[PDB]
Design a protein around this ligand. Structure first.
Ligand SMILES: O=C(O)C1=C(c2ccc3cccnc3c2)CCC1
Length: 166
């Protein structure tokens, strides 16, 4: 199957009201982005959902990556297997502004997307990371230069983002 049902916001940013796990299972994209933390502990939010859909195979692989490589930096990324969801999973760490991490690092986090021509992704630093999701979409539009297909689960949030960008 291929991406379908997206609204084009800019030349390269698309958005859909969808569960990213279901999108990944339908499309099997080359790259799905995870909203990760520095130790790749996929406990909740989008990370918990993607790891559960791999039946914990992502967590076991992530623990081995950390033991061998050490933690990521805030604003950084690594490429690991996508298992049943994608060819690859790009684990990206946005700042957790509720813990005083600098919002400037949200631009650095989105810069990692430019290494891939096409990605399925969530908004970074939204949810438990504490950033305003509309601000995160603005940074995505201002920073990502490759084609990104954004999945937003919550309908109320999705409608607010589309109203702000149209
Ligand atoms: O897209 C959303 O509505 C947002 C979040 C979320 C959280 C958990 C999810 C689990 C499965 C699939 N999608 C998810 C999405 C947290 C911030 C905004």
């Amino acid at each position: 199957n291929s991406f379908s049902g997206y609204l084009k916001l800019t030349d390269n940013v698309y958005i859909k009201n969808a569960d990213i796990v279901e999108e990944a299972k339908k499309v099997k994209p080359t790259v799905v982005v995870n909203a990760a933390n520095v130790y790749l502990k996929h406990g909740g939010g989008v990370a918990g959902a993607l790891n559960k859909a791999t039946n914990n195979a992502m967590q076991v692989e992530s623990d081995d990556y950390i033991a061998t490589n050490g933690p990521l930096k805030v604003g950084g990324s690594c490429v690991l297997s996508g298992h049943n969801l994608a060819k690859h999973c790009l684990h990206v760490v946005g700042p957790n502004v509720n813990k005083g991490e600098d919002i400037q690092l949200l631009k650095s986090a989105y810069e990692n997307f430019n290494q891939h021509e096409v990605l399925l992704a969530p908004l970074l630093s939204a949810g438990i990371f504490g950033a305003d999701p509309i601000h995160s979409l603005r940074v995505c539009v201002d920073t990502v230069r490759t084609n990104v297909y954004l999945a937003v689960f919550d309908k109320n949030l999705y409608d607010k983002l589309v109203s702000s960008f149209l």
